[PDB]
Design a protein around this ligand. Structure first.
Ligand SMILES: CCCCCCCC/C=C\CCCCCCCC(=O)OC[C@H](O)CO
Ligand SMILES: CCCCCCCC/C=C\CCCCCCCC(=O)O
Ligand SMILES: CCCCCCCC/C=C\CCCCCCCC(=O)O
Ligand SMILES: CCCCCCCC/C=C\CCCCCCCC(=O)O
Length: 394
């Protein structure tokens, strides 16, 4: 509440002391349960480590850095920022808190960039990265996360004012490091938003092409069944045969590839019956095409339509989690940069309501430990298959 030293106006509303501690606890419970489940599924349930799970497992590592500090953080907010712990416990908590935020920001982009190449550029060299190469990338990206946040271990803590454990970054005017801080968030924000746009755009296109081929197939058969001309059926099978050949090249399955062989072959048989004036004998042969697509095709259409739906769901939650967790604190920090430049630090009451917003959006930053489990769930069908086979045992 009182004006701190070195031109620093800080406020501790009662809403922060009363509402945030139980929020920190809920984020601690679901975060430990979700990441603990992920840690079990990643490391013990499945034995195959792909390049995507290696990049994705870093979020689990980045989340446990915040999970460890959450009980201590609760102890600080209930004590009104009275840091009962020592010097070293405070430096480590600030380091791990920044390591969790900066680490989650970086690896949520790597997850989006990885899925961007799996979808948009399937044949690019970055899709064939070895597990050792992906492990080198993750280590190099952790080394970057170290350097950006290692400075929080140099400053001695706490600071008497009762002792407070905080890196007062909301009392620093906009300078070079603060510009770096904003750029370290907006470049990943631009990459994730662009990748999410391209992936959703490309995947909704593939689904629209599958349903367009399947539409022209069922629709054309209804023409053949309702046909009263011998020439109408010759042209109707033409659009079907072109649709059956387009669907073969679209699929990026052993019993589904040979199903189009039988599908096209049955069209060729009725194609000869259509050219011989067999109006009734070609309309009937076209009904055998209804029994082959149910047994052979419709299953692969639903499997791919679900694979596409889960991929779009995955890239959306990665973008949504990145925004609703890290953007609110950024906007508030930008508003403080303006007020320090506009109003200065003579009258502190200009920062009363803004400080309440900062610690509110600060708990949004801590939400990434209970929302990353949602990212893990939609990453691969192995996660829902873990709980489905676990519930199979009843
Ligand atoms: C930082 C500000 C100044 C610099 C701003 C730079 C902005 C563009 C960056 C990268 C584009 C290239 C990567 C993403 C799109 C290209 C994908 C690619 O490489 O695809 C190749 C090929 O199509 C596969 O088959
Ligand atoms: C349990 C060990 C499984 C293999 C190692 C997984 C990574 C462990 C970690 O770094 O937390
Ligand atoms: C080299 C250019 C660096 C650009 C950094 C990121 C761009 C956006 C920067 C902040 C936008 C709002 C500015 C914050 C308060 C500015 C007050 C001031 O004039 O000092
Ligand atoms: C809007 C500001 C972002 C501008 C930067 C890059 C272009 C990204 C396209 C817009 C994001 C689409 C939202 C989404 O589908 O996730």
């Amino acid at each position: 509440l009182e004006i701190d030293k070195k031109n620093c106006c800080v406020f501790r509303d009662d809403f922060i002391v009363k509402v945030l501690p139980p929020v920190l606890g809920l984020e601690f419970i679901f975060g430990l349960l979700g990441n603990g489940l992920a840690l079990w599924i990643f490391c013990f349930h499945l034995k195959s480590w792909k390049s995507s799970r290696i990049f994705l497992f870093n979020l689990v590592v980045a989340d446990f850095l915040l999970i460890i500090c959450l009980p201590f953080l609760m102890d600080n907010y209930v004590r009104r920022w009275d840091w009962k712990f020592g010097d070293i416990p405070c430096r480590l908590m600030l380091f791990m808190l920044a390591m969790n935020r900066q680490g989650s920001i970086i690896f949520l982009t790597v997850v989006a960039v990885d899925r961007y190449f799996r979808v948009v550029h399937p044949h690019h060299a970055l899709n064939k990265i070895s597990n050792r190469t992906a492990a080198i990338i993750s280590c190099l990206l952790w080394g970057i996360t170290i350097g950006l946040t290692v400075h929080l271990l140099k400053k001695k803590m706490p600071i008497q004012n009762a002792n407070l454990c905080s890196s007062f970054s909301i009392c620093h005017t906009f300078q070079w490091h603060e510009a770096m801080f904003l750029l370290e968030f907006f470049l990943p924000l631009g990459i994730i938003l662009f990748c999410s746009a391209r992936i959703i755009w490309s995947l909704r296109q593939r689904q629209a092409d599958l349903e367009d081929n399947w539409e022209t197939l069922n629709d054309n058969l209804k023409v053949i069944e309702k046909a009263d001309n011998a020439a109408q059926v010759k042209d109707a099978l033409t659009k079907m045969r072109a649709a059956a050949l387009d669907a073969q090249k679209a699929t990026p399955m052993k019993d589904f590839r040979h199903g189009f062989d039988i599908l096209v072959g049955q069209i060729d048989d009725a194609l000869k019956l259509a050219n011989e004036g067999k109006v009734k004998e070609a309309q009937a042969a076209a009904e055998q095409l209804k029994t082959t697509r149910n047994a052979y095709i419709q299953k692969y259409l639903m499997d791919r339509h679900a694979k596409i739906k889960r991929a779009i769901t995955f890239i959306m939650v990665v973008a949504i989690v990145f925004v609703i967790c890290f953007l609110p604190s950024v906007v508030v920090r930008i508003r403080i940069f303006w007020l320090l430049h506009t109003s200065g630090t003579q009258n502190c009451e200009v920062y009363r309501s803004v400080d309440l917003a900062f610690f509110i959006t600060l708990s949004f930053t801590y939400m990434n430990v209970m929302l990353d489990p949602v990212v893990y769930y939609f990453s691969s069908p192995s996660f829902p298959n873990f709980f489905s086979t676990l519930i199979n045992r009843c």
